[PDB]
Design a protein around this nucleic acid. Sequence first.
RNA 1: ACGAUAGUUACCUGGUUGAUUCUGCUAGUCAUAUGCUUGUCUCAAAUACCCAAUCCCGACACGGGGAGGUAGUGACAAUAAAUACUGAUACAGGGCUCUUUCGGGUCUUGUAAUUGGAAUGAGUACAAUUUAAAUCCCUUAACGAGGAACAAUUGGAGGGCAAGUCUGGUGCCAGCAGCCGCGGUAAUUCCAGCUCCAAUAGCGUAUAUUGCUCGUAGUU
RNA 2: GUUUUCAUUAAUCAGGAACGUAAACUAUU
Lengths: 45, 48, 35, 204, 96, 31, 159
Amino acid sequence: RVQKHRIYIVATNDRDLKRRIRKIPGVPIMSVQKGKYAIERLPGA
Amino acid sequence: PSSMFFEHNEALVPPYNVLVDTNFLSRTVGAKLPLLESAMDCLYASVN
Amino acid sequence: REKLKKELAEIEERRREKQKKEKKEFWEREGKKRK
Amino acid sequence: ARQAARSHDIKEKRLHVPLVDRLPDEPPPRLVVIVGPPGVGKTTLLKSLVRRYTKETMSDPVGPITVVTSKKQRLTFIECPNELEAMIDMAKVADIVLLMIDGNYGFEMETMEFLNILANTGMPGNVFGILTHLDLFKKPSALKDAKKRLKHRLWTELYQGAHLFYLSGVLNGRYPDREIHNLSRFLSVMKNPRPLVWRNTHPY
Amino acid sequence: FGGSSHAKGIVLEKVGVEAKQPNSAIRKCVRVQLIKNGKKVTAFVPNDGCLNFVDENDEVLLAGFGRDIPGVRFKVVKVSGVGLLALWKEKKEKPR
Amino acid sequence: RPVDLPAVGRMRGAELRISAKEAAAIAREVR
Amino acid sequence: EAARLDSELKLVGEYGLRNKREVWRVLLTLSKIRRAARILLTLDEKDPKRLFEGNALIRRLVRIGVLDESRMKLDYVLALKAEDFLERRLQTLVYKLGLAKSIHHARVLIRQRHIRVGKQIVNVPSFMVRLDSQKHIDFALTSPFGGGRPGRVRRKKAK
RNA sequence: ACGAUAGUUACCUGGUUGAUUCUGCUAGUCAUAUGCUUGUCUCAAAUACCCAAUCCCGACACGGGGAGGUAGUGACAAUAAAUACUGAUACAGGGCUCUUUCGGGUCUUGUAAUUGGAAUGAGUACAAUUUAAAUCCCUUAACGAGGAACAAUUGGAGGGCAAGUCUGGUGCCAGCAGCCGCGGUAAUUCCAGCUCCAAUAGCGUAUAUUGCUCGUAGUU
RNA sequence: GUUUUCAUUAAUCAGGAACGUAAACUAUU
Ligand SMILES: Nc1nc2c(ncn2[C@@H]2O[C@H](COP(=O)(O)OP(=O)(O)OP(=O)(O)O)[C@@H](O)[C@H]2O)c(=O)[nH]1
Ligand SMILES: [Mg+2]
């Protein structure tokens, strides 16, 4: 889905899917970090 | 794809489309944490 | 192409170094568990 | 914890190499050179300092001038003439240095030459920049700009945060009394000279 | 060392001054003696031409070396109150 | 780990034990 | 990260900025405004706090010309962005009004004191021009594009 | 009414083991020391000048005041932003990219080329003004830009080089490297100013880091 | 088991009290 359209923010927490979606340019990764969420590769935030 | 300037996605502007995985969903219920409210408090923007 | 192959060989050297470091850290943790 | 960290940093700042003192119980007069380019007024500062200390108006002060400045310590002022042979002769001799800069004209090659001759030969304890000819100025914004740039270049030259005095006018042919009084406040109270190896082995 | 970030030292002897190859780490390493504690540790001068500014019996500041002899922990930062990279870049003269 | 378990205190069977600090920690968070 | 580097480079190129400190400055004030909008969306509708404070925030943004006069909801205040702020800067307004040929020409003009905003000349290119004051950007009277003296290279050449 | 009059109308299949494919291989400190750099404007953490304003004391309108106000330093922070803008012509044919690389993708890019325009604030500065007297501010006549300068820095990564030097060895190879070369210092004009990445009037480094049972006080 | 009685007497253990050649393959379910 993300490879086709690439408008999404992928919210995961497993490092396998995180490393899989870090290879493709321009999708942010949202993951919960025990107090709140944390967005990874979004430039505007 | 259009709206891609060298690994900078210009297609994502608010309201942010956020795909949710099962690991993220199980852990955001486990951490007593409301899903849309915490996503909006993280991004400071309206998510769908 | 030769410049790209040089930089790819450097990346593979770093990968082998980090693989050896993680292997020794894991087996240092396990060798205390089997002791 | 941070107090312990700062205490450890200062305790490491206090350290040096353990060199030998070789200072007697009745010490000789410490030697003050008055070094600068020609025409900057070294003889005028010599007249003004000896009038501050011993109240004697010298019309032509030459040679070393020994002067009692405290009950324990005393000084001697020697004005270096404008020759490089005398400057290289006295840079290995000087105990404290009064290094003169000519104000509006800026730095000179004789000043930079004596600074690096002194640094290569042996660095003494106290070198004081004395900046004169400030009255040859018309705009007091250009005055503080020249003071700032000369202070920063001197700080790059010898060390950061030195003492740079500003001697403004020439009233009675001598200097202003308050300016030379704070200059002598700085060069009157004193600390033991730095243990240089050449002066602590060879008798001069 | 100690509890501080930089230590001072006396350059006892430039070990490896007779090494052959120019940028050898044995050429770059220098045995110093720390003032506060008294022990002799070894430190890297950052460059072989920069070794010439380090003379014997000079007060030397040294810090950690964070990244051919793996395990020499310190590097010489200042020599006699003047920064060693400034001496190498010919910004300052060394007061002796 | 179980998802349904609440975050305040430990749970043993059907009995949930809250230490005296934890009920004070919630009263601190309210103020 | 490469996404942040390419985004900040697109901002610095598309609006003729000097470094990334100006980008981070605008992103900080935008995040402050957007945080205020999110805190006002926390409350329910028809609370008096949300009503009057959101009306104050929306009227402020419409008056400083960032938010469009069409859309006036707090969700669009959340949907605000740094491209809108850098568009409201003065230097891009000189480039878009066409007193200058490029954005770097506009920064050069504002630095060497040719344009004026209303009455007084403006020396700073990051002057946040409001919507009421957008129209009165023109060359000053002491500028050779405005009048007065023919200028410097003109004087050296005409001598 | 046709429908199991003893629900045995049950159980008669609990799923070893392997192959292949697709994934996976740190950042902040109001935290101390220290190194390099610093042109402009406000601003401020830390032996200067005067009673001119507000105030006080006296034979007393005048005499006298260590409150007060004025100025100077300052990369500890914090604020704004210079170090250039814009054309024409000539010439070259390549520039760029990647998953998949002796392969694919895209179409205008250059040059230490030749010339032309303007704009000018840092600084220099006549004045007048400000003020106890000065300074700053605001006004302001006159100068004030072509790089070899009115001279941007701090770090990191990488290529290219000798009749030079060193080390290893089953010739010519490899490694570390190389201010050091035959001559030559008023001699040389050379990668002529090597290429890329990051921050940019700021930036780096170091360290700290972020045996069982009974039984009492007690407890439920 | 009873066609038996007092109705909290109880639960837990700080302190204390009585009894005393070896090792070597491992609220329901
Ligand atoms: N305006 C002004 N004039 C000065 C100042 N200092 C010195 N002068 C004058 O400059 C002249 C130089 O005299 P000296 O000071 O004797 O020169 P010197 O270098 O000390 O003596 P030599 O080394 O013999 O020339 C004197 O006539 C002074 O009046 C100053 O600060 N301001
Ligand atoms: Mg003299």
